[PDB]
UniProtKB/Swiss-Prot annotation, chain A:
The chain crosses the membrane at residues 63-81. This is ESX-3 secretion system ATPase EccB3. The chain holds residues 9 to 89 of 518 of the full protein. An ATPase. Part of the ESX-3 specialized secretion system, which is required for siderophore-mediated iron acquisition and for the secretion of EsxH and EsxG. Belongs to the EccB family. It comes from Mycolicibacterium smegmatis (strain ATCC 700084 / mc(2)155). Part of the ESX-3 / type VII secretion system (T7SS), which is composed of cytosolic and membrane components. The ESX-3 membrane complex is composed of EccB3, EccC3, EccD3 and EccE3. Residues 1-18 are annotated as: Disordered. It is found in: Cell inner membrane. The lineage of its organism: Bacteria, Bacillati, Actinomycetota, Actinomycetes, Mycobacteriales.
UniProtKB/Swiss-Prot annotation, chain B:
It is found in: Cell inner membrane. Part of the ESX-3 specialized secretion system, which is required for siderophore-mediated iron acquisition and for the secretion of EsxH and EsxG. Disruption phenotype: Deletion of the gene impairs iron-bound mycobactin utilization and EsxG and EsxH export. Part of the ESX-3 / type VII secretion system (T7SS), which is composed of cytosolic and membrane components. The ESX-3 membrane complex is composed of EccB3, EccC3, EccD3 and EccE3. This is ESX-3 secretion system protein EccC3. Disulfide bonds: none annotated. Signal peptide: none annotated.
């Protein structure tokens, strides 16, 4: 097809193979953390962790949507004046 | 002086299924494209 190059990483066996000390959370790490904490937090309220349907995040995103529509109407009537 | 013992058969406790349990390797870090606000700001 387009001949893609799946991410790879070998070894080093030399001097520059243990010098970096760069702490920077990549997108994957923050996604993984979100998911792990939403599979634990759904293991002490639902008592099953097959994670097929999560209602907790549903509740939280519902209250968030309430907040966002709140601020939207706030400014959309602030423009009214 | 002493009694007699007869070679009654030994009982069998359930032994091990000494096989080779195999495990599938995990997935392969699927590449995720940038969220892109332009096509992410519809709601």
């Amino acid at each position: 097809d387009r001949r893609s190059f799946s991410s790879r990483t070998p070894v080093n066996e030399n001097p520059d193979g243990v010098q970096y000390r760069r702490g920077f959370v990549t997108r994957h790490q923050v996604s993984g953390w979100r998911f792990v904490m939403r599979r634990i937090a759904s293991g002490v309220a639902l008592h099953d962790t097959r994670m097929l349907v999560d209602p907790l995040r549903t509740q939280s995103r519902a209250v968030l949507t309430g907040a966002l529509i709140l601020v939207t109407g706030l400014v959309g009537c602030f423009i009214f004046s | 002086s002493r009694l007699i013992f007869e070679h009654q058969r030994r009982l069998t406790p359930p032994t091990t299924r000494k096989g080779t349990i195999t495990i599938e390797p995990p997935p392969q870090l699927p590449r995720v494209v940038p969220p892109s606000l332009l096509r992410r700001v519809l709601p």
